[PDB]
């Protein structure tokens, strides 16, 4: 379902540049996304919490070193 | 973006301090391979006594991290690795994950960089 | 290097993402998009001869240049 | 639908008459796990004199047989297998392929059905 | 079966009518290949018999590979 | 160029869409012939029977092959 | 549909009577490869004293017959031919024309069927 | 635009550092004739042990360099070639490639300019 490739070009929507996401690459309107650019590569995924995290996993560590 | 090798991710799960700090210093998106998740899930149930903890600490990682599935584009890259480097039984699963990094133009983060210098085009961070 | 949050929207009832200036690619530049599971990646296509030669140069060379067999 | 185990798909690619005759009698969708695709790609160049033939034959198979990407549902299935049967390093790859058969409610076609009797709800066809 | 005719416009696209004796039927996916003057059309989806027949027309390798993962 | 599409209906006839790169244009008379599962379409410019009859009525060269 | 091999078309251009009759007996679309057209154009000027006649007769053929261009789909089939049968310098052009027949699922009509029996999938009409 | 002759493209595929540097400095579109693509495809499995490497390197070239389909316009240029220069059996393939350059008003890059000096109006870059 969400396993696809596409090609496209930048366009202008309002006073902002935008990019279209064809069906199998889109996320749906109700999902908050994180958008990170590294150099010229843009990575987009649902926002589920930053890496600083979740009490940075102060759960209780297993005894064996990994 | 960054893709963690499985051992880096295992060192994130079981709370290794010298990796956890290095991972937060990363200023890019941190992606987990579905393949690493498979290896991680199996590791939960390796030793029954740590399973409760490892189950809990993995479930937290999977709540947060975005997962890269293994799809046709990654398999295409895997094929290109074998065409250039030759088949290697030992490095099949490692190449599968690196192939995902390549498809998504992401830096591969690993403790085992030497095993990956035969992959044309791969960006590597050796830890 | 730069981070933002947001939702998609409908442009021509195709789904689209707004790109702020610090995440934008500039106009008229053609992009590659790849979606695998949770991750969408978008980057400019590398289609110049210099990109091709860079890629070729990263790959092992064959042990000889073939003869053309006219 | 059927999912072909890697060795069955190897024997199809390489023209084993015992498998080619059997696969044609199968009804409905015949699918490959993308894990099996990875293994199949790795074998194309291993006998150099036959690389062109194996490339052509694999390419024809991949034009017809849908290949199942490895995603969150397959990993969930993998987790259920280790919970029910316990972890086994030697069986990870096999269980990833079987997990994708489970995730698509597919009959798994295999030469070694005795090795898959610990996977609950898995449908098996023994060749 | 043979027909003659011109194209027409449908939904912002050219199209051609396939008279009764040429039609493929409902919900059939088609592959279209245009080369020079010639457009060739045939069903995209092949049976498992189609696959095996194609494989059997091709030389087969001088050996059946062993699955390296089992060793 | 290559494409995939599906049959649709226009009135009492099946039809297939021809994408821009595969299209023939508006005023071109086409020949359509099916043999088994293969449909072949090309501009109507004369039959093989007409062609050969024409050739036989023109003078031939002294010998074949060139 | 049928694709004519170049020699069949040559015998048509120059008026071979034991070929003109069999071409009419064909019940299907008859197609000309652009590769044959190139060869036919060359043969127009091979013998200067007969170039006028050959020109007129070839123009009548090109006015009627549809021409298959040599495109990416044909070259894909050519690659497959080489993968299955191995490379042959002497038969490159033969195989390019037969590759067009394969791509357009047409029956290939030739005087030299023996040169074409190593082409998997090719429907052959031997004359 | 430039059209690379077959031998130039072979030197590119096979990693000749002198050709590769020179090609990098050319301005505008770098193109290949589909006839050259046919020639390049035939060389991939020439040397069995190098097959996977040549496969991968040619596939990378065909992802970037547009390949010109051999069309009616190219055959028109071919006819004008033989009309003015006379027929040559040895140079049919060479002239099909040059005809595509003519049809696109492209400069033809070649090691073999001597064989294309009889083609009127051909822009040539002789290496």
Nearest to C56 among H42, H47, H60 (CB): H60
Residues 75 through 94 of chain D touching chain E, CB cutoff 8 Å: 93-94
Taking the CA of residue H53 and the nearest CA in chain B, the distance in Å comes to: 5
- Method used for this model? X-ray
Q: Which residues lie below 8 Å from residue A42, measured CB to CB, with a gap of 6+? A: A35, A36, C19, C23, C25, C41, C42, C43
Nearest to E69 among D16, D26, D93 (CB): D93
* Structure token pair of residue D82: 């280790």
Annotated binding-site residue? H71: no
Mark D74-86 as b/e (b = at least 16 C-beta within 10 Å).
bbebbbbbbeeee
Resolution given for this structure, in angstroms = 1.9
* Structure token pair of residue H32: 């290949």
* Structure token pair of residue H47: 């040397």
CA distance F27 to F29: 7
Do strands G2-4 and E2-5 pair parallel, antiparallel, or not at all (unpaired)?
A: unpaired
* Sign of the dihedral defined by the CA atoms of residues G114, G117, G122, G125, in that order: positive
Q: Which residues lie below 8 Å from residue H90, measured CB to CB, with a gap of 6+? A: none
Q: Which residue has the tokens 């981070």?
A: C3
Nearest to B105 among C41, C55, C58 (CB): C41
CA distance D82 to D88: 8
> What are the structural domains of chain G?
1-127 (3.40.50.1010)
| Residue B96: closest CA among B65, B61, B113, B72 | B72
G83 in reach of chain D (CB within 8 A) = yes
| Residue H42: closest CA among D56, G89, G36 | G89
CA distance B4 to B67: 11
Name the β-bridge partners of D2: D30, D107
Tell me which DSSP letter residue E58 carries: S
B105 in reach of chain A (CB within 8 A) = yes
Q: What is the 3-state secondary structure (H, E, C) of chain A?
A: CCEEEEEEECEEECCEEEEEECHHHCCCCCCCEEEEEECCEEEEEECCCCCCCCCCCCCCCCCCCC
Residue H35 with chain C: CB contacts under 8 Å: none
Polymer length in residues for chain C: 70
Enumerate the H helices of chain G as residue ranges.
Answer: 6-14, 17-24, 34-44, 51-64, 72-85, 92-103
Residue E57 with chain G: CB contacts under 8 Å: 120-121
∠ Cα H13 H17 H18 (to 5°): 110
**What are the distances in angstroms from CA G61 to CA F31, F59, G10, H44?**
17, 14, 11, 37
Taking the CA of residue D105 and the nearest CA in chain E, the distance in Å comes to: 20
CB D13 within 8 Å of CB D120: no
Instruction: Compute CA D55 distance to the chain's CA centroid, rounded to the nearest angstrom.
Output: 18
CA distance F15 to E10: 10
CB F32 within 8 Å of CB E16: yes
State the residue range of the domain holding C47: 1-70
The tally of domains found in chain E comes to: 1
Touching subunits of D (3+ CB pairs, under 8 Å) are: A, B, C, E, G, H
**Largest distance between two CA atoms of chain C:** 59
């Amino acid at each position: 379902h969400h396993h696809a490739r596409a090609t496209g070009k930048t366009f202008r929507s309002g006073n902002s540049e935008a990019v279209r996401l064809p069906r199998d690459l889109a996320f749906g309107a109700d999902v908050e996304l994180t958008l990170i650019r590294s150099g010229d590569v843009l990575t987009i995924y649902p926002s589920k919490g930053s890496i600083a995290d979740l009490v940075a996993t102060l759960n209780q560590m297993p005894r064996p070193d990994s | 973006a960054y893709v963690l090798d499985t051992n880096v991710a295992i060192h994130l799960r079981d709370g290794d301090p010298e990796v956890t700090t290095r991972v937060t210093a990363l200023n890019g998106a941190i992606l987990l391979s579905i393949i690493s998740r498979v290896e991680l899930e199996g590791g939960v149930y390796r030793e029954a006594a740590q399973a409760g903890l490892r189950r809990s600490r993995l479930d937290v990682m999977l709540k947060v991290l975005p997962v890269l599935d293994f799809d046709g584009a990654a398999a295409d890259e895997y094929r290109r690795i074998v065409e250039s480097a030759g088949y290697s039984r030992r490095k099949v699963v490692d190449r599968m994950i690196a192939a995902q990094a390549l498809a998504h133009r992401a830096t591969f983060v690993t403790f085992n960089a030497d095993d990956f210098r035969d992959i044309p085009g791969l960006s590597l961070l050796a830890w």
